[PDB]
Ligand binder design. Structure first.
Ligand SMILES: [Cl-]
Ligand SMILES: [Cl-]
Ligand SMILES: [Cl-]
Ligand SMILES: [Cl-]
Lengths: 134, 134
């Protein structure tokens, strides 16, 4: 019941798997007019592109193999990019991973297989968290 | 192994119970030189003080009775105050409450009874998320 100008929202979709990446990006593209960018990189490689990251409002990470090194990288990532909202897509809603995500700066956790209604709700919440980028 | 100037950090501690409030504030005061402010108000009353809230870096909420109205209030609170880090202190680490907190903008969930090491870790993480206040 709260609309945001979707075309104004830059989403970075990150996954190691070509098929999952294409599917995640296709699902975001179906949810609204959000400007979607794809990457095959891991959170530890993404952090190294400080200027490039500044252009995004949302970072949707596929959490296939959550390691302590990647949680630390996501922590470094949300720390240096407070304007960036990190969403984690996983196949595990166990308390430990949910709490580890939160402590790494994640704002939402989405269940895989991803659901249109769930995604649209997630994106509506993340649109509300968007700040002006210069 | 990453230090922040604790005296520079303004913490608002919120609880309905006089005894819990005093105990939470005493525990924060023992964790470091953080400037601590106490309130008996609920998240729905706190949101109404926009200018006052701007002065805080951290909001530690006692989550004794988490209602949908208060999660919405915390959502409104983190939405209008992106510089404010909300920590929730509860006696329930169930996935549903953990995920509901995250979707309401909470950055960390602490277990009651509160533990010094846990708190010091939580506060160190929240210090890293502090942004310049004007
Ligand atoms: Cl790429
Ligand atoms: Cl760069
Ligand atoms: Cl008071
Ligand atoms: Cl005010």
């Amino acid at each position: 019941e709260n609309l945001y100008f979707q075309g104004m929202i830059n989403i970075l979709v990150a996954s190691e798997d070509a098929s999952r990446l294409a599917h995640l990006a296709r699902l975001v593209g179906d949810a609204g007019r959000y400007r979607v960018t794809r990457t095959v990189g891991r959170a530890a490689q993404i952090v190294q592109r400080t200027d490039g990251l500044d252009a995004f409002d949302i970072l949707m990470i596929d959490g296939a193999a959550l390691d302590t090194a990647e949680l630390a990288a996501i922590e470094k990532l949300s720390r240096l990019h407070p304007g960036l909202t990190c969403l984690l897509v996983t196949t595990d809603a166990s308390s430990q991973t949910l709490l580890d995500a939160m402590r790494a700066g994640v704002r939402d956790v989405l269940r895989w297989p991803l659901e249109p209604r769930a995604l649209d709700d997630a994106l509506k919440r993340a649109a509300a968290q968007c700040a002006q980028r210069d």
